[PDB]
Design a protein around this ligand. Structure first.
Ligand SMILES: [Zn+2]
Ligand SMILES: [Zn+2]
Ligand SMILES: [Zn+2]
Ligand SMILES: [Zn+2]
Lengths: 77, 76
DNA sequence: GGCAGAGGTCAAAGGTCA
DNA sequence: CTGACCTTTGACCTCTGC
């Protein structure tokens, strides 16, 4: 009955943009895609996305978001 | 129009669990972020008001905590 | 109907920099 | 260090199309 975000391991509201996601992960994906935002990383793209420290590397979040099958094409827009 | 429990200034909004001015919000963030502890030169009951808020950082932080600002809420 | 999976709001967190 | 002011986040909403 409990489902966890494939990005950050937070309680997941459900499948969003093709991925079991927390509400935070959804909204990041949207804004990133809607604003055509690519970010950069300052730690050799090694950044580990955890519920606690997910807002550390926007770049590394979007990497994991796409890695885990969130789909730009699914965000309206 | 609501007033900051720490300094008594006009509050921006509720900040870390208490109706706070931006200043005390800022103070609180940086204090917890840099795990700053503070020393008092006036026996630790320094009056904290808008006009004279920055005399004692120590006494301010005490007030911040006492009036219910929650460190845990401030993030890393 | 019923509900997943899109959308949006705005307080409360964040970061900026004179 | 400070705080006026600006940006992001994510809990909680609604809509609507299978
Ligand atoms: Zn997540
Ligand atoms: Zn990174
Ligand atoms: Zn104040
Ligand atoms: Zn003092």
């Amino acid at each position: 009955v409990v489902e966890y975000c494939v990005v950050c391991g937070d309680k997941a509201s459900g499948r969003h943009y093709g991925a079991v996601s927390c509400e935070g992960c959804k909204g990041f994906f949207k804004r990133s895609v809607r604003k055509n935002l690519t970010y950069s990383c300052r730690s050799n793209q090694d950044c580990i996305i955890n519920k606690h420290h997910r807002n550390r590397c926007q770049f590394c979040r979007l990497k994991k978001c796409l890695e885990m099958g969130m789909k730009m094409e699914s965000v309206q827009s």
